[PDB]
Amino acid sequence: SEEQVAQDTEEVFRSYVFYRHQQEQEVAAPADPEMVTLPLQPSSTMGQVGRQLAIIGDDINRRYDSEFQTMLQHLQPTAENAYEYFTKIATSLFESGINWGRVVALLGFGYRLALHVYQHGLTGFLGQVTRFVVDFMLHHCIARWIAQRGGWVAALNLG
């Protein structure tokens, strides 16, 4: 069900966020303690899905990242508008269709958004970004799509 994939996203994302972050610490990366302080369950199935996504995120992040950074300075989001912004950008990743790389990038952006806002004083925002990601997927058929493919675990087969 799309509902299941949507409810699994919390862990997948948090885990992706943990792994993307840990890996990102091996130059002198943006510093964010909230991302390791993450409620995470490291090697559970979803934890494994998040890790695998973070790993694959590697070259996908090369088109996407620098770009997410830039726009983030463009309109520098507040707890108040950040939703409409996450939405403007997430909506653009699926313009021309959905696929795993685009999905991985949704997280990548969820991740950059989280990091960027923390950089600017906003603490405890991961739960909210996580809801942005989940809410967006439900309403934009991403959750339905992942389901159609066998769910988040289907990502275990990408690498």
Residue positions in the annotated binding site?
135, 139
Encoded amino acid at 80, one letter: E
The contacts found for 97-102 with CB under 8 angstroms, 24 or more apart, are 98/141, 98/142, 98/145, 100/56, 100/155, 100/158, 101/60
Closest CA relative to residue 68, chosen from 31, 11, 115, 35: 115
Helix (H) or strand (E) holding 124: none
Residue positions in the annotated binding site for Zn(2+)?
135, 139
CATH topology for 1-159?
Apoptosis Regulator Bcl-x (1.10.437)
The C-alpha atoms of residue 151 and residue 133 are separated, in whole angstroms, by: 16
| Strand, helix or coil for residue 138 | helix
Resolution (A): 2.5
Q: How was this structure determined?
A: X-ray
* Burial environment of residue 153 by CB neighbours within 10 A (0 to 12, 13 to 18, 19 or more): middle
